[PDB]
């Protein structure tokens, strides 16, 4: 089966720079059936380029297409505020009948901002129910890459924590992340000190925020 | 506005032929004497009707110019298309050229003298290639006369030459079929 | 009218259930065009589901939905259908209809798309959220609400009955192993105002007719 | 030889076909879109100057977009393709008419009818000229009349087939 | 390339169109007028020798009347215009047929049907020849038959549209 | 110029017209006969590659049978006749498309629809290619669809006229 | 099999162009470097893309070859059609020939050096004449490049040369219109 591999997975650029998005195909393909699509979250995909190089109606000319054989390119000449979204390449005719790329995200490049870490102990209502969720918050940082390590009584925890990240803030282009360690009340009172350890390239050294039950 | 059958309004459109400047030549007329066929955004070809010669010899060393290969390949094609469209051309001494350094300099001596004039053939070809606004250049079974003594074809720069007629590609594209037609064996 | 595809259908079903998605054309010659279905499962990318030629002669299916999904059209009604049977949890996605025309005169492309159709396949029962406070512990402090164990999406969290909006981050929900969703909404406030100002999160979960307000207070 | 270049411009439209002259292709005018019924005549007619220009501008658009620009402008491509885009005997006709003092087409100006409520448009026909003077509308008014008739006939053929 | 010369001969007629071959254009015969429905086919057909001759004689008439005669006869004009008047592949067809012993058109003799009371006429078709011997009418009688049929079909299409 | 070679293959058939590609003209396939309604379109269309090939193979058949073979193969005849058989601008179109990365016709492979009980056949259309890769059927499926529609329209026009 | 509208089955046919071998030339491709245009059942023409020259002089004595009149008249027409279709040819020293004894030996020196290269013109003509399977010979506004140094055109024998692409007449028949087009005056 055909495989379309876009690169990079995430393209980080400031407003007003050339964005060069790439799409590489498993096999050699006919350019006439390569298409590009923009996808913002709040709406349906938007056809940008078809036939490798034809620009669809309503597309504002900074978007261009080129490519041949196995390597195809979508280019935005001057990134504008609305141009930061997901982009997908597409090939019709092989197997699957319509093949898609995994998508490239273009984001706003920013100065590096360090996360401001906060730890939240479990509420007593939650304990009265039988489960404990301790929440660690990483606020207003860039870039998005951040490592959260949950340690209980100085023991590394794996498999008991889900993460969730906000989308880039429209004003200051920062991210925020929350890690939720979920433990049963029984295991919660087994151990005393609870800590999340944050490593981000904006921090001078890995920051740890902790608490002791009570 | 003009309304036909009550509901159909007469409307017009004018094509901007300069959009084609990167794929095909564009002809236009500056004034009575100066006419242009441009290629792209950098180079072009000025067709002059003048009493002032620029070449006093009677040579057209194309074989030399080809070997040296310094000229603009598109401009040389146009020159060839122009000269190969001249009907019944037979006075090779009425055509002088200078290609030094790769320039294009071609001079037809229209004064070599109605229908059997070499000027007739040259002017007819000039009429067809500057078709847009060539009607102001000159005033008999298609046979034409002019008081001017020379047609000069020199390469020029890309400027706002099209001061009388807007650029058009029709004159050049319609001349392409006249090549090697009514040409004499030698 | 304007050239558009008007989506209909979708909703919530248990595994093994069925759902019929439909999509009606407006302002374009529906019969001229092939029709397509594309979905996006959460956190993943665009994925083609199935397609049907302009005259219904040919239908094609992604291997993942073969034998379960059946695409069809009614050119007289200018309508397109997707009958999803034997639904799986991984079939949860937004779904889109899109036209295309497959001729040697045009490239291949999907120019006209419908709006998203939400499909949720789960064994979970609809359940309002349990809202627990995230209490703050100089400078600025952070407090929030933990909206736990709700189904399905969405929930709308507002702070202080709409009046407090600056510096609020309501995080995307994570699907827990239980089959239920959980999220946190946080807000940073000046530490000085911890005593003077009261802080309420307002969690509305329209599918379960639940509106919960919770005081977050220090200690 | 006989022209063959097909016009491809169906994307995003209410029904495939037609052709839209962008602002770049028009002198001091906004975009002008012509429907399938008008443009589809260009596939068959052997004597509509505007159809030859449609293929010419489409070839220029296609060639620029699908081929990489050379360092020095070459006219090799247009010399190779001209006869698949335009009918060199059509402009021979216009040349012979000019030679003869008969009004002729210089390929620059065209006229069409436009329905005042449905927007339906006729295939533009060349506005003729002679010795630098363009014809007045009065010179070909009965042509405009029969064009309105063909528009009415086509509009009635459409309402019949739209059942 | 594809022919483009239009025939202009509507003056004083009952309805515009058609073409009248004057006595000068016919060998030992009086004037022959052909109606619009027959002649209008010359605007579309790519293989009717008589249509090529209609444009040829009309060009000769026009050129003589609208251009001043040179002192010495020049053939420059016809060399420039021939392909807008005739289909040089049509007479290539007639040449290849001749080479092959197949009956062919030498462009000199034509036949048509003529309604004995309404005078309606068909578009003349070339009377074929081979090695100096012209075909007998019997050789193409079924052609004449289908021509009479098309005449009857057209006469019935006219009575229908004449309401 | 415009093609003119007529196809002659009516002998022994149920009704005059059509054309049968013998086994010699087909790669690894038995004879294929196409009816009058399909083949008669070749007399009018200016852009069907298969029609140009029909005239090419018919000219080859005719020339071989009606002319005596030379000692050394001469290509004089085909150089003289090529433009009465094929539209050199049609393959210019295919060349320009190839140059542009657009799928094009290499004149070798064609597709048609064939009614499963009445045997009625459509005029074969060229199967396009690009950089050595032939299009998949999916690439032009909607073309096949409208072809089936024209077949149904023609079959209904026949039942109407068969009264 | 594919059924459209329930009753129309999709079917295909492939023309055997070798049936035309006695009336018109047939082009085909043997491999990346070797391409053929055949005439009839006895003779033909091998087009080679190679780094190995076969002619070290710079002569193309056509006038001599014509007078002696020993060559195959059809093959010489093809050679002429090929060379007369080269756009903007101007380096006559890049073309060497040997016609001794009536053979056909023509060598274009592609290494005489993008769009103004004589190789461009030669390769474009080669592209059009070996149209069937020329895409595997080489990989910019139609302008082409190649790492090969020579295009050689030699007469050959009738053998099973068409080992990569099946014989076709289209490449030759469609080149016929490019003759004396974009040709320079000399
Ligand atoms: C048209 O659709 C084709 C698939 O459609 C199916 O088949 C047709 C005939 C109908 O029956 C239809 O109803 C079916 O749905 C599609 O076929 C694809 O063709 C490409 C070649 O263009 C193949 O890629 C090459 O595959 C070979 C074989 O190994 C593959 O085997 C299996 C399939 O059996 C694949 O799943 C594997 O992943 C393997 O890739 C490889 O050898 C080759 O890779 C190497 O070789 C080439 C040179 O040979 C090098 O250039 C590469 O860099 C590698 O070094 C290719 O990957 C593809 O497998 C094949 N898929 C199928 C399912 O057959 C065809 O592409 C469509 N045409 C167009 C123009 O889109
Ligand atoms: C176009 O080409 C013309 C010919 O070009 C030559 O041949 C071609 C095939 C190429 O190889 C090309 O590269 C060659 O140059 C060319 O005309 C030539 O112009 C030169 C001047 O630069 C002439 O040289 C002069 O020769 C005379 C004597 O020769 C004449 O008389 C004899 C006897 O009657 C004849 O047999 C000849 O054919 C000539 O008619 C010398 O007296 C003269 O000496 C002085 O002249 C120059 C003048 O400035 C001085 O600067 C020198 O220092 C000398 O002191 C030259 O030596 C050459 O004869 C002439 N050939 C012909 C056939 O007329 C023409 O100039 C080219 N035009 C352009 C625009 O390039
Ligand atoms: C293509 O034609 C070329 C020219 O052909 C001649 O002219 C045409 C119009 C016809 O009439 C044709 O039939 C003629 O042959 C041809 O080039 C020619 O090749 C021959 C060799 O066979 C040369 O003869 C040799 O001449 C030199 C001296 O002449 C040279 O120098 C003088 C002074 O500089 C110049 O004025 C000349 O133009 C030359 O540049 C002799 O030294 C030499 O003697 C020995 O050479 C051979 C070598 O093997 C020995 O076998 C002999 O026995 C001698 O002992 C030759 O006599 C001739 O000069 C040359 N002409 C030119 C203009 O270069 C070419 O070979 C033809 N190509 C093909 C593939 O047919
Ligand atoms: C010679 O031929 C060339 C090829 O046809 C011509 O090139 C074209 O030139 C125009 C500018 O003159 C380029 O326009 C582009 O447009 C952006 C912004 O335009 C904005 O406005 C339009 C409405 O007018 C709107 O629709 C757009 O969406 C934009 O928002 C300019 O900033 C750029 O310059 C950009 O290139 C064409 O793109 C360009 N085409 C190509 C293929 O290069 C050239 O103009 C011709 N020369 C002459 C003298 O006519
Ligand atoms: C080059 O062009 C030539 C002219 O088109 C080709 O000549 C043709 O070659 C074939 C053989 O390849 C000849 O076939 C004839 O058939 C008989 C017997 O065939 C029997 O089988 C068929 C069914 O397949 C059946 O229908 C017949 O009735 C027969 O019963 C052979 O024994 C003979 O060889 C005979 O000639 C063609 O007749 C022949 N045509 C001409 C005009 O000469 C030649 O094949 C081409 N070369 C290549 C390589 O394709
Ligand atoms: C190449 O073919 C020629 C010609 O073959 C004849 O013409 C063809 C179109 C086809 O109809 C063949 O069947 C014909 O035989 C050959 O020259 C003839 O060869 C035959 C025997 O094969 C012989 O009887 C004739 O006298 C020859 N001369 C003619 C017909 O003028 C020639 O031998 C073939 N060359 C090779 C290398 O096979
Ligand atoms: C153009 O041609 C004319 C006519 O052949 C040349 O005019 C002649 O020039 C010389 C002297 O100037 C004499 O032969 C005659 O006295 C002139 N005759 C006429 C009728 O003028 C003229 O010189 C040529 N111009 C160029 C630049 O070569
Ligand atoms: C170029 O020179 C010619 C030389 O003949 C000029 O034509 C002559 O002009 C005078 C006075 O204007 C007339 O008396 C002659 O009858 C003209 N000769 C003709 C028409 O053959 C011509 O005017 C000059 N052109 C320019 C622009 O100076
Ligand atoms: C006509 O063309 C010539 C040749 O290109 C021009 O002269 C050259 O111009 C380039 C830059 O454009 C210089 O680098 C060369 O040194 C020039 N060479 C010579 C011999 O002049 C010439 O300028 C052009 N003429 C016009 C009017 O545009
Ligand atoms: C025909 O006339 C109508 C009205 O005069 C034109 O419609 C205008 O153009 C826009 C989009 O192109 C339409 O949405 C509006 O109805 C009109 N806008 C105005 C008048 O500002 C239409 O473009 C004309 N068609 C042609 C080919 O000229
Ligand atoms: C068709 O036949 C009729 C009668 O045979 C011809 O009509 C004759 O011509 C004049 C004027 O041309 C008519 O007014 C008369 O009715 C007839 N006069 C006679 C018979 O002396 C008519 O010309 C024929 N048409 C053609 C094209 O030959
Ligand atoms: C269309 O399909 C039919 C059936 O598939 C084909 O008919 C076959 O051919 C012979 C004679 O050619 C017929 O008498 C039989 O009905 C069929 N014989 C078989 C299937 O062995 C017909 O040839 C097809 N037409 C084309 C152009 O391919
Ligand atoms: C083909 O042309 C090239 C370039 O003109 C020739 O290569 C030159 O050959 C000689 C020595 O071999 C010298 O002029 C240079 O050193 C070479 N230059 C390059 C770039 O290779 C080559 O000889 C020609 N081939 C033939 C057979 O004439
Ligand atoms: C023919 O010779 C050319 C000489 O340039 C070869 O091309 C060079 O190959 C080497 C090594 O393969 C590369 O490093 C150079 O960059 C190439 N030069 C180019 C591409 O201009 C070519 O490979 C030879 N071909 C064959 C078939 O031997
Ligand atoms: C290229 O053509 C030449 C000339 O016909 C061939 O050489 C002749 O071949 C014939 C027989 O085919 C012999 O009778 C002559 O004696 C040969 N003459 C010479 C000078 O060789 C040559 O064999 C052909 N080359 C190829 C590869 O087919
Ligand atoms: C064409 O095919 C060749 C050979 O398989 C390949 O190298 C090339 O990438 C393909 N695409 C082109 C030339 O655009």
Numbering used by the authors:
A (entry chain L): 1 to 214
B (entry chain A), G (entry chain A): 59 to 171, 179 to 204, 209 to 255
C (entry chain H): 1 to 137, 143 to 224
D (entry chain a), E (entry chain a), F (entry chain a): 260 to 422
Reproduce the article's own wording on this structure.
The LASV glycoprotein (GP), the sole protein exposed on the virion surface, is the primary target of the humoral antibody response. Upon reaching the mildly acidic interior of early endosomal compartments, GP undergoes a pH-dependent intracellular receptor switch to disengage from α-DG and bind to lysosome-associated membrane protein 1 (LAMP1).
The 18.5C-36.1F-pfGP ternary complexes formed crystals in the space group P321 that diffracted to 2.7 Angstroms (Å). Application of crystallographic symmetry revealed that the pfGP trimer bound three 18.5C Fabs and three 36.1F Fabs. In the 36.1F structure, both the fusion loop and fusion peptide are well delineated, ostensibly from co-crystallizing as a ternary complex with 18.5C, which targets an epitope that encompasses the fusion loop. The longer CDR-H3 of 36.1F instead reaches behind the loop to form a hydrogen bond between the main-chain oxygen of L104 with the main-chain nitrogen of H230. The CDRH3 of 36.1F contacts GP1 residues N74, E76, and M96, which are poorly conserved across LASV lineages (left). Furthermore, modeling of the M96R substitution present in lineages LI, LV, LVI, and LVII suggests that the larger arginine side chain would sterically clash with CDR-H2 residue L104 in 36.1F (left). The slight variation in approach shifts the 36.1F light chain away from GP and results in an epitope that is ~95% GP1 and 5% GP2. In contrast, the 36.1F epitope, which is predominantly GP1, can only block LAMP1 receptor usage.
